[PDB]
Amino acid sequence: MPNLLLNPDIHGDRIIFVCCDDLWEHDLKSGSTRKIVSNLGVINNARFFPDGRKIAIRVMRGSSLNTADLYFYNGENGEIKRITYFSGKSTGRRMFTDVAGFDPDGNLIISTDAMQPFSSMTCLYRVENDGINFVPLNLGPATHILFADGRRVIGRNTFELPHWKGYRGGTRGKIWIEVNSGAFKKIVDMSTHVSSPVIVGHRIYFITDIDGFGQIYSTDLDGKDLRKHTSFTDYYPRHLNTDGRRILFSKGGSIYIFNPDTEKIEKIEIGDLESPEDRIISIPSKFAEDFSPLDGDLIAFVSRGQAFIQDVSGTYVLKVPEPLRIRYVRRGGDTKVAFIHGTREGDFLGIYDYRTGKAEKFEENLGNVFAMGVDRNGKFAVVANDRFEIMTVDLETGKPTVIERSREAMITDFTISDNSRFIAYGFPLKHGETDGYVMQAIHVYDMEGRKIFAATTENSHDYAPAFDADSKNLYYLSYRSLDPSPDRVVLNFSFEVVSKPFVIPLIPGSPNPTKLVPRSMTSEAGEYDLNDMYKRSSPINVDPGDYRMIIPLESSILIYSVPVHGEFAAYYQGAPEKGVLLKYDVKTRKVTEVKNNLTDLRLSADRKTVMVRKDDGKIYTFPLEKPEDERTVETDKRPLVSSIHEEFLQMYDEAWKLARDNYWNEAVAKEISERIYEKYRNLVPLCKTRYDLSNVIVEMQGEYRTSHSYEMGGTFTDKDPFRSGRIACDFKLDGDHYVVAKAYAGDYSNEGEKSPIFEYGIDPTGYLIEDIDGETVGAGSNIYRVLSEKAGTSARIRLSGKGGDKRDLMIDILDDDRFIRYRSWVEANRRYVHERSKGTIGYIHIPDMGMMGLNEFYRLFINESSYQGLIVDVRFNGGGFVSQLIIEKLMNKRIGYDNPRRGTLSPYPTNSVRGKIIAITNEYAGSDGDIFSFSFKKLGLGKLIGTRTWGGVVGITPKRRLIDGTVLTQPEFAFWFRDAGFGVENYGVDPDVEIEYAPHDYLSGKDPQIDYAIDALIEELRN
Amino acid sequence: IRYRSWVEANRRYVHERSKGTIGYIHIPDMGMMGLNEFYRLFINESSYQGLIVDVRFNGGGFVSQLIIEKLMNKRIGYDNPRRGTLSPYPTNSVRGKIIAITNEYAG
């Protein structure tokens, strides 16, 4: 059982590399190996210093390796030391904050965005005093920095891209070179991506897959004389590193060597190194899901692929006796529960009796199940698959019977009448193969006569169907109560609270039960007749709002309400939505609150037990009759047990299946999948850590050669994330004191947009930082570390400005100051554009096409839209989906005015741009950013300036995760531009005028892109 | 109830006569109600070969600019899913030819 070796570095006979997240050293001479450093977290890069004595190491921390920092290793005394306290943000695809290279003097040059507004600004910094001071090289963003003959060699976006093989977009790795002690020239700019550059002698060796596969090449210090050296076919080579003589690298999990002279490739022998305990223990709460209440006051829940029947206490726990991957567990009888078991083949229905033991599992495939339920009389079950089908499975025989198939989306919202006769469900529909919206009408299926009826019309969104105990009326919710709510910032209106409940008596002639129509004055007791029942529909007198569930009770109705709220947290942090359980008494027609701070709710089949999760993450349970009596559902009593190798295989196969099942093009899928399966499956057994699996999985996702194949979430370590103390400032070592080099601030009156020092009425810029919380910082005291240790608290900071000016304030040491830096940048560019255009041009910047984008666009759109000209800077745009909305705005043309008796003119439309518009774009703007760029030109709103963009317009919508929480994504929605097709994918967008931003432009402190834009508009504004 | 009856009648009429190739939308005024009625059908009628934006008897208001901004959208792309139907881009884009009806009772 060998390991998965990777990311090596060489120096003489010694060779360091990564195995099991730890760093190892190998001596070709003796042939021995040893672990030189461990227990720091997950390590992915180790670099030899010039003398070959010390080593710079990049280590990641945080459950999902969301944070990272740099460490030093002295092989002389075995000293270990953290160098940076930036807590750089990183993801699988962009593992920023690493070693850039080493300057002639033998100093370490790092690449980080810790002090930049955009993650992609991984600017270069020289490390001094072991992390005490940081001197910027002002060469712009870079991934590698080499030196040759006194010439700086810069590698842009030159990191590996395993997730996207054959990438040919604008963010492809490129190499520049100095030519005139300050002048730079781009020398390697192939059609494909260039990664991991090295220089042996006077040739730069790098990797690219222009020939259809990853190989090693080189060219003189002029990008000329291209040569193809390797000819691999098994696995792409990665992580090139050298010592000046031979090149080192990894492939398919082994470490190889390439001698530039001999041109010979040889594999280093290392054999087995480490085989940790395969049987691991996990915490059920950390991977729990699908919590459901059963009879006898029992509970059922799924975790890390396993299922359990336990009491609220968590003291008496039973595991369902079934192999890996239980997707769903559902009450199916007094002591019997039905489950959904998933395998590489698909999803299958199962049944288990936690009393006897009988667990007969079915074999009839159901496809990809996403919703499952069982009637109250354990006769059959209802299932929804990704084929958009809703079906009934005989819980006795196993024969699934398709009832109806939607062609728009899955039928996951359904309910069964208590008498097991009707099945009400939401049926997504469209009235055209190209409609912009998808409607949803409730459908009711009768087990007797086997026929479907229309409970609702197909003009809006009707959901949450639910029958009453006696099964006499069907209740449901709908967003039909249209009524606009005003926007407090932008002239706009939205449907905020248009949700309302309705009812439909299954017996014609019977009135709305909530109308309280005296029995003596009605003549019910007719007979079931579901024909044209949508005509008998009636609403229930309850104020409009945002309802997600309706539960009909004897003399009251429970309703789940969700108060209006922003979507920022939900969009970026996946933060759960907050609801509250309300009660409506039919008699008194008065509403009350039953339970708040709810983020999820489940209800028993008997309607007597309520299970819910609150905003604190915990799960509770209480009787509906006495909601005051809730207990906490504990599950962490019994350790969760599993096998790394059994889980890793399971996880690989699922990742491999989703990638295949969700690829936008089914055809390409059948081929790619079948051709990459085995090849990458053989690496799984070499994996020992979640990080090992990641390497295999990502490389296999890259085999689809498409954008948006990401890997997020998942548990990679028990190490806590790195902390970084920030006060929105830039420090500089000057003598024996740190000076406030810069004090970031954007809109002083907005929230969170300036150094917390400003609150004390003083601009820190220029001042000298004496000490923090008593401890003196400076020449012999790392301020970065001290601040790190005070992150998230308030500390006393002694400052000193001009003269005898001395301050001593309690400053809030923030955990992050990115946004403050972003806003600072935007405001700076905004101020710049005004002054340079003599106050005739506006500025607006869009960071992404998500909630934040929408925020920033409107934040300035309301003050900049009425200038002679407008610059819509969308550089570094991270994509999203709201581009269409922003375009629609800019699309407006001013065609009139309102003349008031008093006041100024009112432009019509209000959201109309006054004059000429111009867009700025770089290679760091992609996805929706790609769409926006192409559109801006396509619609002729103005000229596009900048550099070709990213090129990944195949959207995604993950709907399933791995047993460890990992959320993989698959390019499922290919964007087709009219008169261009899918051309944008794997290419990007070409600006009308190309304005590069060379390293020398950064050295001169000039933005050639924004300058051109301004100067260009002034030209158009001469008319 | 009579207004909605009328709109739905005209809507059913436009479908049958255009052999299901034309949509219908009516705007009673340019106030909150207009905004309500426009979107009430705009979401089911905007993707036909043709669209009729009947604005007769329109009582005025101020949200006309907002409704125009919508109709101003031109369809320039689609989203191709692995399962499901095409998604027009923009979403609030009218699919084809539009035609407006107006009388002396719209001001």
């Binding site: 999203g880 989906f881 996805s927 950013g929 769409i931 959207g955 | -």
Partner: peptide, 4 residues
């Protein structure tokens, strides 16, 4: 939601 078709993020890009």
């Amino acid at each position: 939601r078709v993020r890009k």
